[PDB]
Amino acid sequence: DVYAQEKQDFVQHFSQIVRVLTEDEMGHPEIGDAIARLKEVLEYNAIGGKYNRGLTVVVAFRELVEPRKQDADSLQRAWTVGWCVELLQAFFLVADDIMDSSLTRRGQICWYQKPGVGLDAINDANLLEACIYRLLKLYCREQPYYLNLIELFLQSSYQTEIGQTLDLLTAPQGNVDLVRFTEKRYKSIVKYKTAFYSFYLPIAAAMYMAGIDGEKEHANAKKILLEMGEFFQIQDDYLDLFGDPSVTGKIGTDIQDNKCSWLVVQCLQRATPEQYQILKENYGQKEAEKVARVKALYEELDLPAVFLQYEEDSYSHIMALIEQYAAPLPPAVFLGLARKIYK
Amino acid sequence: DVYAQEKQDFVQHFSQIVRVLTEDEMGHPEIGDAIARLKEVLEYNAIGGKYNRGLTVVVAFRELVEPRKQDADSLQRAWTVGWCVELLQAFFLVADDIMDSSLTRRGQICWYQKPGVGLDAINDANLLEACIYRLLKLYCREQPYYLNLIELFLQSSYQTEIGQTLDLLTAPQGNVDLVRFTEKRYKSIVKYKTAFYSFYLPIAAAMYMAGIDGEKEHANAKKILLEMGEFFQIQDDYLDLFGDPSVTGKIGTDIQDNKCSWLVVQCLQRATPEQYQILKENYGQKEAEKVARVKALYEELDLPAVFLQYEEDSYSHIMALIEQYAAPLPPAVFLGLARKIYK
Ligand SMILES: O=C(O)c1cc2c(-c3cccc4ccccc34)cccc2[nH]1
Ligand SMILES: O=C(O)c1cc2c(-c3cccc4ccccc34)cccc2[nH]1
């Protein structure tokens, strides 16, 4: 795929990002110790993932911009804006792992769990966020899209933070309540906390870099991308349990962690008073036996079949969304992304 | 003073800020619960202080802009940018109180310590930061200084975060070391963590709003304001101990909290090997007797006299800085601020 083609150049560019960001202690030797800590924070948190969100900027750039205008400088800017997306995610992950007491992230121990780090990781998360705007100034200050990119990264941080607030209010640690776990609530959490920054932001960033700044074009691209975001998170909640972890790189911690998953939401909708009481008793419990009972209840309520009928309607619908709203953008912009998610 | 004159109108404008920020759930009823939490976060954290940093924007605006151009709309923008400074501080305080395990802030319990809040306050701090850029867009999008304000608020967040990193590395909780407590380190911490956002940011924001965007003018104003910032923090560290808390609104928690204070720094400089060992044994201890021994050592080393000779040299020096670097700005811009700090 077009993602694997662009990966190597993109991952190689991280060294440049780190160099340019650590080139602040040249004239200001006084902050050197802080800059060394910033480097360590970048290396641990911005590296070790799939880089899919960041690569989406680069892939979309290649497809939106005329090959003739894709010079050395424009590509460097595309790889930087791609890394800004990856930094925005690192900032979210570092902080979210603190708030939900996570132990591991991308196979390794969470940054905040590292000895000597702890709650200092809050400042580290803030620094990761600050790096975006430093990189945008260093690389894009002179571009006609500079302001659009700044506003886009700010609006996406804001939407994600609203999504995170909504998530925290729905699943309060200690105040365990399944009444709050509605489809309307789930869809809003997914839209604000995940779909905007993961799907709309990288394509939207690529669009502005190509000079596509029209509100209607951005509204059209957003209608497609937000639906792709809903599907992705719904599919990810299934794979957390009903998915053979050979393919993935994570296992079912959602039942024991008391998460507002798409599974628990459908389970509640299709529940009899007795079925609900079983879920009420077993969901969110650290006990192995209790986790095993929820899985059995999900299987009983046709949830692997419910997810298949959802996939079916979703495959056709995203194709309808691309058919109707991709123009004037090349449909391959959305299709290349949908292939990675839907297959 | 000119600060007390502008206070009432400024504090009354908070209601408008909260209304405009909570006017996002009109078209998006789905995020209503999150917006209610944002309102509660604003009301608890942005209110209850002296509002000095925010008022500095408004006072400086009144003195920099021609009375004829100070219309209804321009004043609303000045009060909003003043509130953006107050929000930037709320974001820093909420987060810093988490990182150093603070119990109280402005006489009341820290937000994170409130039952049901806890580490959710990290998201709350992030939301407070996001509100700045929302207010700048809502009020200043159409102004020729829009971008300058965005970049100024971003650069100030970055400088404060670097200052906070430097502070955390100097005073690691558990890894108690006085060797790190140097004057060069203290001055860098104060400059990055405090002086930029408290002194340079509000005047600089007022300057851009007046159309004063020149690099030399900003460099001149910064030379004055950074020295005012150094003095302020040095004076504040003294008042923490040697200052009768009748005047202030806080007491000596710096010795027991193991802080890199200007006092402990001078104490180390003027220490014999024996005097250092006493400090090494008693500094950073929760024990009342141990806290009492440090105070006695500071008194012995002429530290109230050392601070007076510092005040003397500082009074003349800031007057020299204003004399030399205020032009073309009215010197009252800096003088009105220095009066509040130096008297
Ligand atoms: O977050 C992960 O580890 C992950 C990412 C993906 C993606 C993916 C591929 C290409 C672009 C994307 C843009 C936004 C979100 C996800 C993608 C497809 C399948 C599984 C995944 N897991
Ligand atoms: O932070 C507090 O509570 C406080 C603020 C002040 C100020 C002050 C006054 C006017 C403008 C300022 C701008 C930046 C920093 C401090 C000021 C003068 C004395 C004591 C203070 N305590």
Residue A24, classified by CB atoms within 10 Å of its CB into exposed (0-12), middle (13-18) or buried (19+), is middle
Please choose, from the candidates B168, B179, B167, the residue with its C-alpha nearest in 3D space to the C-alpha of residue B265: B179
> Tokens representing B164?
């906070």
Residues ≥6 apart with Cβ < 8 Å to A95? A121, A122, A125, B122, B123, B126
Expressed in angstroms and rounded, the spacing between residue A340 Cα and the centre of ligand 1 is: 7
A277 annotated to bind ligand: no
The whole-angstrom separation of Cα A268 and Cα B277 is 65
A250 annotated to bind ligand: yes
Residues ≥6 apart with Cβ < 8 Å to B125? A122, B90, B91, B92, B94, B95, B98
Radius of gyration from C-alpha coordinates of chain A: 21
Ligand 2 lined by B105 (C-beta under 6 Å): no
> Tokens representing A209?
């870099």
Give the CA count within 13 Å in the CB-facing half-sphere of B266.
19
The whole-angstrom separation of Cα A162 and Cα A160 is 5
DSSP one-letter code for B191: I
A100 annotated to bind ligand: yes
Expressed in angstroms and rounded, the spacing between residue A254 Cα and the centre of ligand 1 is: 19
Cross-chain Cβ contact A33/B166 below 8 Å: yes
Residue B77 known to be catalytic: no
> Tokens representing A270?
């299709």
Q: Which residues of B touch A175 (CB under 8 A)?
A: 116
Q: Which residues of B touch A192 (CB under 8 A)?
A: 31, 34
* Helix, coil or strand: residue A104: strand
Binning chain B into helix, strand and coil, the percentages to the nearest 5 are 75, 0, 25
Q: Which residues of B are annotated as a binding site?
A: 50, 53, 89, 96, 100, 105-106, 193-194, 233, 250, 259
> Tokens representing A338?
């949908």
Residues ≥6 apart with Cβ < 8 Å to A290? A281, A282
The answer to whether the CB of B179 falls within 8 A of the CB of B160 is no
Per-residue HEC secondary structure of A8-74 comes to HHHHHCHHHHHHHHCCCCCCCHHHHHHHHHHHHHHHHHCCCCCCHHHHHHHHHHHHHCCHHHCCHHH
Please choose, from the candidates A63, A58, A31, the residue with its C-alpha nearest in 3D space to the C-alpha of residue A330: A63
A194 annotated to bind ligand: yes
Q: Given its phi and psi angles, is residue B118 left (phi above 0), alpha (psi -120 to 50 degrees) or beta?
A: left
Please choose, from the candidates B275, B340, B263, B265, the residue with its C-alpha nearest in 3D space to the C-alpha of residue B307: B263
In chain B, DSSP finds a helix count (H) and a strand count (E) of 15, 2
Place of tokens 């809003």: A188
The whole-angstrom separation of Cα B39 and Cα B207 is 30
Please choose, from the candidates B199, B203, B198, B219, the residue with its C-alpha nearest in 3D space to the C-alpha of residue B333: B203
- Active-site pick, B24, B37, B39, B100: B100
Who among A99, A130, A134 is closest to B123 (CB)?
A: A99
∠ Cα A284 A290 A296 (to 5°): 105
What is the DSSP annotation of B81-109? HHHHHHHHHHHHHHHHHHHTT--EETTEE
Ligand number, closest to the Cα atom of A52: 1
Place of tokens 């009903």: A242
The whole-angstrom separation of Cα B225 and Cα B146 is 23
The whole-angstrom separation of Cα A226 and Cα A334 is 12
The answer to whether the CB of B96 falls within 8 A of the CB of B193 is no
Expressed in angstroms and rounded, the spacing between residue A233 Cα and the centre of ligand 1 is: 10
Please choose, from the candidates B190, B165, B317, the residue with its C-alpha nearest in 3D space to the C-alpha of residue B265: B190
* Helix, coil or strand: residue A105: strand
Ligand 2 lined by B341 (C-beta under 6 Å): yes
The whole-angstrom separation of Cα B40 and Cα B57 is 25
List domains and CATH numbers for chain B.
Answer: 1-343 (1.10.600.10)
* Helix, coil or strand: residue A252: coil
Tell me which amino acid residue A163 is.
Answer: G
Who among B30, B137, B164 is closest to A123 (CB)?
A: B164
Q: DSSP alpha helices (H): ranges in B271-302?
A: 273-282, 288-300
The answer to whether the CB of B229 falls within 8 A of the CB of B221 is no
What is the DSSP annotation of A159-225? HHHHHHHHHHHHS-TTS--STT--HHHHHHHHIIIIIIIIIIHHHHHHHHHTT---HHHHHHHHHHH
Please choose, from the candidates B126, B114, B132, the residue with its C-alpha nearest in 3D space to the C-alpha of residue A94: B126
The whole-angstrom separation of Cα A128 and Cα A122 is 10
Cross-chain Cβ contact A37/B133 below 8 Å: no
DSSP one-letter code for A80: H
The whole-angstrom separation of Cα B326 and Cα B335 is 10
Q: State this model's resolution in angstroms.
A: 2.4
Please, which experimental method was used? X-ray
What is the DSSP annotation of A253-303? -TTTTT---HHHHHHHHT--HHHHHHHHHHTT---HHHHHHHHHHHHHTTH
- Active-site pick, B1, B19, B33, B50: B50
What is the DSSP annotation of B25-73? TTT-GGGHHHHHHHHHHHHHHSSSS--HHHHHHHHHHHHHS-GGG--HH
Tell me which amino acid residue B247 is.
Answer: V
Choosing among A154, A167, A184, A185, which should be mutated to test the B contact, i.e. which has the most B CBs within 10 A? A154
- Chain B closest-CA separation from residue A247 CA (Å): 32
DSSP one-letter code for A330: -
> Tokens representing B285?
């201890």
- Active-site pick, B61, B77, B92, B237: B237
Cross-chain Cβ contact A119/B137 below 8 Å: no
The whole-angstrom separation of Cα B315 and Cα B319 is 7
Instruction: Tell me, rounded to whole angstroms, the distance of Cα A200 from its chain centroid.
Output: 10
**Enclosing H/E stretch for A109:** strand A108-109
Q: Measuring CA to CA, how many Å separate B34 from each of A227, A336, B22, B86, B114?
A: 22, 34, 10, 21, 18
* Helix, coil or strand: residue A305: helix
Expressed in angstroms and rounded, the spacing between residue A341 Cα and the centre of ligand 1 is: 6
Number of CB pairs, chain A paired with chain B, less than 8 A apart: 119
> Tokens representing B195?
């002086």
The whole-angstrom separation of Cα B298 and Cα B303 is 6
Ligand number, closest to the Cα atom of B194: 2
Cross-chain Cβ contact A123/B31 below 8 Å: no
Residue A287, classified by CB atoms within 10 Å of its CB into exposed (0-12), middle (13-18) or buried (19+), is exposed
The whole-angstrom separation of Cα A255 and Cα A276 is 15
Please choose, from the candidates A242, A253, A246, the residue with its C-alpha nearest in 3D space to the C-alpha of residue A296: A242
Who among B168, B173, B191 is closest to A123 (CB)?
A: B168
The whole-angstrom separation of Cα B254 and Cα B262 is 11
Residues ≥6 apart with Cβ < 8 Å to B244? none
Other CB atoms closer than 10 Å to residue A8's CB: what's the count? 9
Phi, psi angles (nearest 5°) of residue B267:
-55, -40
DSSP one-letter code for A251: -
Residue closest via CA to ligand 2's atom 20 equals B341
Q: Which residues of A touch B166 (CB under 8 A)?
A: 31, 33-34
The answer to whether the CB of B225 falls within 8 A of the CB of B199 is yes
Cross-chain Cβ contact B126/A161 below 8 Å: yes
Phi, psi angles (nearest 5°) of residue B328:
-90, 5
Residues ≥6 apart with Cβ < 8 Å to A111? A41, A44, A45, A94, A97, A105, A117, A121, A124
Expressed in angstroms and rounded, the spacing between residue B198 Cα and the centre of ligand 2 is: 8
Cross-chain Cβ contact B126/A157 below 8 Å: yes
Place of tokens 């971003």: B154
Cross-chain Cβ contact A122/B95 below 8 Å: yes
Q: Given its phi and psi angles, is residue B258 left (phi above 0), alpha (psi -120 to 50 degrees) or beta?
A: left
A53 annotated to bind ligand: yes
Phi, psi angles (nearest 5°) of residue B104:
-130, 155
The whole-angstrom separation of Cα A158 and Cα B21 is 12
Q: What is the atom index within ligand 1 of the atom nearest the CA of A56?
A: 11
Cross-chain Cβ contact A31/B122 below 8 Å: no
The dihedral sign for the CA sequence B150, B152, B157, B159: positive
Residues B5-13: contacts with CB under 8 Å, at least 24 apart:
B6/B55, B6/B58, B6/B59, B6/B62, B7/B51, B7/B55, B9/B58, B9/B79, B10/B51, B10/B54, B10/B55, B10/B58, B10/B79, B10/B82, B10/B83, B11/B51, B13/B76, B13/B79, B13/B80, B13/B83
> Tokens representing A170?
């729905």
| Positions of A marked active-site | 50, 91, 96, 100, 105, 167, 193, 232, 236-237
Q: Measuring CA to CA, how many Å separate B288 from each of B244, B284, B292, B293?
A: 19, 11, 6, 9
Place of tokens 């792709």: A228
Q: What is the atom index within ligand 2 of the atom nearest the CA of B3?
A: 10
The answer to whether the CB of B281 falls within 8 A of the CB of B294 is no
The whole-angstrom separation of Cα A248 and Cα A3 is 18
Which residue is closest to B147 within chain A, CA to CA? A147
> Tokens representing B296?
């006695």
The whole-angstrom separation of Cα B60 and Cα B159 is 22
Q: Measured over all CA atoms, what is the biggest interatomic distance in chain A, rounded to whole angstroms?
A: 69
Ligand 2 lined by B56 (C-beta under 6 Å): yes
The whole-angstrom separation of Cα B166 and Cα B181 is 11
Instruction: Tell me, rounded to whole angstroms, the distance of Cα B236 from its chain centroid.
Output: 12
The whole-angstrom separation of Cα B97 and Cα A341 is 41
Please choose, from the candidates A117, A237, A221, the residue with its C-alpha nearest in 3D space to the C-alpha of residue A183: A237
Cross-chain Cβ contact A130/B158 below 8 Å: yes
Choosing among B39, B119, B142, which should be mutated to test the A contact, i.e. which has the most A CBs within 10 A? B119
* Helix, coil or strand: residue A108: strand
DSSP one-letter code for A248: S
Which residues make beta-bridge pairs with A109?
A104
The whole-angstrom separation of Cα A14 and Cα B252 is 46
The answer to whether the CB of B174 falls within 8 A of the CB of A150 is no
The answer to whether the CB of B2 falls within 8 A of the CB of B336 is yes
The whole-angstrom separation of Cα B29 and Cα B186 is 48
Residues ≥6 apart with Cβ < 8 Å to A253? A240
Place of tokens 């009105």: B336
Other CB atoms closer than 10 Å to residue B291's CB: what's the count? 19
